[PDB]
Motif scaffolding. Structure first.
Motif, PDB file in Angstrom:
ATOM      1  N   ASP A   1       0.694  -8.587   0.540  1.00  0.00           N
ATOM      2  CA  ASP A   1      -0.012  -7.635   1.387  1.00  0.00           C
ATOM      3  C   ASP A   1       0.944  -6.897   2.317  1.00  0.00           C
ATOM      4  O   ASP A   1       2.153  -7.117   2.313  1.00  0.00           O
TER       5      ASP A   1
ATOM      6  N   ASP B   1       1.882 -14.834   8.920  1.00  0.00           N
ATOM      7  CA  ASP B   1       1.669 -14.406   7.536  1.00  0.00           C
ATOM      8  C   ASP B   1       0.236 -14.688   7.102  1.00  0.00           C
ATOM      9  O   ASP B   1      -0.034 -14.861   5.905  1.00  0.00           O
TER      10      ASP B   1
ATOM     11  N   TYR C   1       1.019  -7.293   5.556  1.00  0.00           N
ATOM     12  CA  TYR C   1       0.944  -7.962   6.856  1.00  0.00           C
ATOM     13  C   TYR C   1       2.114  -8.911   7.094  1.00  0.00           C
ATOM     14  O   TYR C   1       2.343  -9.831   6.309  1.00  0.00           O
TER      15      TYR C   1
ATOM     16  N   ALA D   1      -1.291 -13.218   1.065  1.00  0.00           N
ATOM     17  CA  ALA D   1      -0.210 -13.023   2.031  1.00  0.00           C
ATOM     18  C   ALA D   1       1.113 -12.631   1.383  1.00  0.00           C
ATOM     19  O   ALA D   1       1.963 -12.005   2.038  1.00  0.00           O
TER      20      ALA D   1
HETATM   21 MG   LIG Z   1       2.229 -10.983   4.229  1.00  0.00          MG
END
Ligand SMILES: [Mg+2]
Ligand SMILES: [Mg+2]
Ligand SMILES: [Mg+2]
Ligand SMILES: [Mg+2]
Ligand SMILES: [Mg+2]
Length: 1052
Positions: free
Chosen positions: A522, A862, A524, A519
């Motif tokens: 990345d 997250d 995202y 997390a």
């Molecule tokens: Mg993230």
């Protein structure tokens, strides 16, 4: 004029200096120093202990309640302790106390490398550690906290000045206000006299209206004080200091500059004739416009021109600066650091940016080069003009990566990008096109303004579809973790996570263990982390450098509106910034006008964090303007149809309404709504809440039908997640093994559900569970009036949203063990039916039609592609893909492990049936204007309920909607009335209410046959209707030659 000075006591020496294997801690006691009188410090003591961080203490007392570690000695300046150590390196943990009460909130850590003589001094209420009592003394009798408020040109509000003979505002342009080596406060000052708070001030700042007020001479050169540090100082009549504090200045900044500044336009304003840059910075000492080449070399630095009336700085140049990168080089006092800071900041009004927002960029959004073909003629596919128009709104709350990150039929280079919406042949786009065709009308986009929390430099990012080796390359936490052995494997991160599933459990949550590290680096994030409010996010563009993202964003908006036929709603997050202060990379506003754009604690000046992060101050005039100006660009230049205000309850009602008034001049049909819960800011202003917005036309999410149908509430964790069943999961009628819900409690939830299906209006009249006649405002919702709205368009109903658990995961938490998989699919549909067939605006999470799971993750902002996956190939619903993140959901692991495997995970058959169910419901809502009357008075004239009161069949919701002669005109030429029957129960139920009528099952549901939510419904000869378990029937009175009798509302 009396000179303000330090106490006539001498600056203290050290009481004792630590010897071998000792530390010494002095407590400088202001009370005891100011008092003439001797002090018995026997109630002062230290709580001392070793931990892994600090371990130099020798045999510290174990018991917290032991107060006997009293001072080694004391003198006039305070007590001191001699502390035995085991070594002279490292650090010790110290809590300074009176009795067992902490005198310093911070748990102190005295570092023997910061202070090598191990002889330190502290002051009650101050977290700092000093090397000598002399330094602590000057601090104890120096500037502390920030509890004076310079609220208009001539008014200072400050408790420290009360009853004091001398109250002054001291100021220094380039340094801190502080006493000199003679202990005298020798900076310049303004003298203030006591006064009574004015009506204007108390109206503006009601939370300060009880503060002692002091008056400035009405001729002070305010601009000269506001350019540096100002400090409020109070003293006794002999000039001896009483206290000194920093000054919060947003109030006087607004009173001095806001109106003049409001009259101007901001940013890099590019137009044929040239460009004008303008930035509001009324406290800055210097501002230079720094122009950068495409390769980020400085090609000019321009001193800007300050406007005295407004405090704005401007610079006008030629149109050759189109496309140039720029920042503002600030020279500005920041009260948090108390320094005249020097730094380059991007434009708060930036409309284009470089990669990762490092530089802003001069752009003309009107440029045809930045538009798709046909953009200027793009029209809104769904009307939003009348309340009836608005009520048709049926929202699909979506996220750029959640839509396409997993879709192998989206071109790889468009996965997770705005342009994925253009991949007409993809599973995802084909699914959305069918959702739209069946009556989903709006796509709501999670943050697509410039978020802070994804790195837009592709080389610094690793996603789970890429090699584990790339992940190790970009993430030193992974490379130093237990998973480092995968570094030189040939597996992708997703391949590793997949293999970790089989041995994943509550006792070994290894999927989330790896994913929590993933997390950090990345692509995202939900994005509720505002970097720039009025630039599209860069990571969702194929090219994040420069203006490229603008055309790609507009291409996506055009695709959604023109090709998918849906309106677009943007999530906006004006209630906070990602960071503040003079240091953080992502602090923009608070670098340029320090302490103005954030809401601050009245005593300390700390930026508050009632939100996640750095709370903003929309009550301040120039941030209200920033918001309205930002919304204007999204409206005009990006053709957004509506706006969802995240945490709208932290905004003044007055500011949201002013913003709406402004945006309606640009788009008369724009729709505003937000999360309007009761907040803690009501002492500062009237908040934009469900209650306060009644009758205004601003929507709010309703938590009433939400809680009643889902079960429980947002504060639940542990066993409550299963015990608190909802109407949708069988409260009362299909209890699980843990719950103690009563039949009376289950019927109260049905009352809230019916009320919500009628628009959660304050004045709607229904028969409650006890047979009592009640207005909506009289149905209790956890102690609050349940019905709060004037019109159903002010209410947004829902049973799933991006935050908290998905509907499917809640049904998995709550469903009885004996409810099989097909039943749970019908529970999902029955829960959604209360929203889709209700009069409030219908809102739903992307993927509810696919039984979307996050593997029980409650707060997935997250949790990456893994837990937020939506599979548009329809193989599963992402349920049971590993335990969710332990930090937030670990206390749910026990209940998860007990419920998780009760039934099989949905597969293609269940997802196809759920999508059919879902589109059946949206098609029914779309098919008739009776479902979406819009006006509250019209709802009250036409909408009623059956199966109410003490003898009701529990869980059976029966709503009628009149189109007959007593309601007024026929709104629907095909029918004289509609019946909505939701049988949220494991029994067949028979209705006689409609005996003798010509009621018929809707043709839409009949056509679906045994795939209908109404499969097996029977409409007998005599007009009696029977519904099977867990079913939904929409029935109608066919309209003949003339309007007929209909279903008139019963008199109550
Ligand atoms: Mg993230
Ligand atoms: Mg020392
Ligand atoms: Mg960004
Ligand atoms: Mg407060
Ligand atoms: Mg009709």
């Amino acid at each position: 004029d009396v000179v303000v000075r330090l106490p006539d006591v001498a600056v203290p020496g050290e009481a004792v200096q630590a010897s071998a294997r000792q530390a010494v801690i002095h407590l400088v006691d202001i009370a005891g120093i100011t008092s003439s009188t001797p002090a018995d410090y026997a109630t002062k003591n230290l709580y001392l202990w070793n931990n892994e961080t600090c371990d130099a203490l020798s045999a510290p007392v174990a018991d917290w309640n032991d107060v006997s570690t009293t001072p080694t000695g004391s003198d006039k300046y305070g007590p001191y302790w001699v502390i035995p150590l085991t070594k002279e390196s490292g650090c010790i943990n110290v809590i300074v106390r009176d009795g067992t009460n902490k005198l310093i909130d911070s748990d102190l850590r005295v570092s023997f490398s910061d202070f090598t003589d191990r002889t330190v001094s502290v002051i009650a209420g101050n977290s700092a550690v000093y090397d000598s009592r002399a330094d602590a003394f000057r601090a104890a009798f120096g500037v502390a906290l920030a509890d004076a408020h310079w609220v208009d040109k001539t008014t200072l509000l400050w408790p420290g000045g009360e009853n004091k003979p001398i109250v002054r505002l001291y100021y220094s342009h380039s340094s801190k206000v502080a006493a000199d080596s003679n202990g005298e406060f020798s900076d310049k000052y303004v003298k203030l006299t006591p006064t009574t708070v004015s009506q204007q001030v108390s109206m503006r700042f009601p939370h300060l209206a009880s503060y002692p007020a002091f008056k400035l001479p009405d001729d002070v050169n305010v601009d000269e004080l506001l350019q540096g540090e100002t400090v409020a100082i109070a003293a006794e009549s002999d000039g001896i200091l009483s206290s000194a504090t920093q000054v919060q200045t947003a109030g006087v900044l607004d009173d001095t500059y806001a109106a003049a500044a409001e009259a101007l336009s901001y940013g890099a304003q590019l137009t044929d004739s040239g460009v004008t840059f303008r930035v509001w910075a009324p406290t800055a000492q210097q501002v230079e416009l720094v122009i950068y080449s495409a390769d980020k070399k400085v090609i000019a630095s321009h001193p800007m021109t300050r406007d005295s009336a407004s405090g704005a700085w401007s610079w006008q140049g030629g149109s050759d600066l189109k496309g140039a990168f720029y920042r503002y080089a600030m020279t500005v006092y920041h009260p948090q650091s108390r320094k005249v800071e020097q730094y380059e900041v991007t434009d708060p009004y930036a409309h284009s940016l470089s990669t990762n927002s490092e530089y802003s960029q001069v752009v003309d959004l009107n440029d045809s080069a930045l538009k798709p073909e046909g953009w200027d003629g793009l029209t809104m596919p769904h009307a939003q003009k009348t309340k009836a128009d608005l009520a048709k709104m049926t929202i699909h709350e979506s996220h750029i990566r959640d839509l396409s990150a997993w879709d192998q039929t989206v071109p790889a280079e468009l996965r997770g990008k705005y342009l994925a919406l253009t991949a007409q042949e993809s599973n995802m786009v084909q699914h959305l096109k069918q959702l739209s065709a069946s009556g989903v009308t709006h796509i709501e986009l999670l943050p697509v303004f410039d978020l802070a929390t994804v790195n837009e430099f592709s080389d610094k990012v690793a996603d789970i579809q890429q090699p584990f080796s790339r992940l190790c390359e970009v993430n030193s936490a992974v490379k130093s973790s237990e998973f480092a052995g995968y570094c030189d494997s040939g597996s992708t991160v997703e391949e590793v996570l997949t293999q970790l599933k089989q041995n994943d459990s509550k006792d070994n949550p290894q999927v989330q263990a790896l994913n929590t590290l993933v997390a950090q680096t990345d692509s995202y994030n939900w994005g509720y982390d505002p970097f720039h409010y009025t630039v599209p996010e860069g990571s969702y563009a194929t090219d994040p450098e420069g203006t490229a993202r603008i055309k790609e964003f507009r291409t996506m908006i055009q695709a959604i509106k023109q090709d998918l036929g849906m309106n677009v709603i943007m999530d906006v997050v004006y209630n906070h910034t990602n960071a503040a202060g003079p240091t953080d990379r992502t602090s923009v506003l608070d670098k340029i006008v320090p302490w103005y754009y954030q809401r601050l604690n009245e005593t300390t000046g700390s930026v508050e964090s009632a939100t996640c992060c750095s709370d903003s101050a929309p009550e301040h005039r120039m941030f209200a303007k920033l918001i309205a100006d930002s919304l204007a660009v999204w409206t005009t230049d990006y053709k957004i149809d509506g706006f969802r205000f995240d945490l709208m309850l932290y905004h003044p009602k007055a500011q949201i309404l002013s913003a709406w008034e402004r945006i309606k001049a640009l788009n008369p049909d724009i729709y505003f709504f937000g999360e309007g819960w009761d907040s803690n800011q009501s002492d500062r202003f009237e908040i934009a809440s469900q209650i306060n917005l009644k009758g205004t036309g601003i929507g709010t999410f309703s938590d009433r039908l939400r809680d009643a149908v889902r079960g429980g509430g947002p504060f639940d964790s542990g066993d409550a997640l299963r015990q608190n069943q909802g109407v949708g999961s069988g409260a009362g009628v299909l209890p699980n093994e843990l719950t103690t819900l009563s039949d009376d409690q289950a019927r109260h939830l049905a009352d809230l559900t019916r009320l919500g299906m009628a628009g959660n209006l304050a004045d709607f009249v229904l028969i409650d569970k006890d047979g009592a006649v009640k207005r909506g405002s009289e149905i209790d919702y956890n102690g609050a009036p349940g019905g709060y709205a004037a019109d159903p368009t002010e209410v947004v109903n829902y049973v799933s949203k991006h935050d908290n658990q998905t509907l499917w995961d809640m049904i998995s938490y709550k469903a009885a063990q004996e409810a099989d998989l097909d039943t749970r699919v019908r529970m999902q549909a029955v829960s959604l039916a209360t929203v889709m067939l209700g009069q409030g605006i219908a809102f739903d999470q992307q993927g509810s039609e696919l039984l979307r799971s996050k593997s029980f993750t409650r707060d997935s902002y997250d949790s990456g592609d893994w837990f937020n996956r939506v599979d548009y190939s329809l193989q599963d619903n992402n349920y049971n893909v590993g335990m969710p993140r332990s930090s937030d959901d670990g206390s749910n692991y026990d209940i998860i492990a007990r419920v998780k495997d009760a039934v099989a995970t949905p597969g293609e058959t269940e997802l196809k049936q759920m999508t059919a169910f879902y589109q059946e419901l949206t098609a029914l809502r779309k098919s008739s204007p009776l479902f979406t009357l819009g006006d509250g008075a019209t709802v009250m004239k036409r909408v009623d309920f059956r199966n109410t009161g003490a003898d009701q069949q529990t869980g059976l919701l029966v709503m009628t909607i009149d189109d007959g002669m007593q309601a007024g005109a026929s709104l629907d030429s095909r029918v004289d009335g509609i019946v909505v029957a939701i049988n949220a129960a494991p029994e067949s139920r028979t209705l006689q209410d409609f005996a003798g009528t010509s009621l018929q099952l809707s043709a839409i549901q009949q056509a679906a046959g045994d795939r209908s939510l109404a499969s097996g419904v029977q409409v007998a000869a005599d007009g009696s209707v029977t519904l099977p378990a867990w079913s939904v029937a929409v029935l109608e009175l066919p309209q003949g030659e003339s309007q007929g009798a209909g279903l008139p509302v019963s008199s109550k």
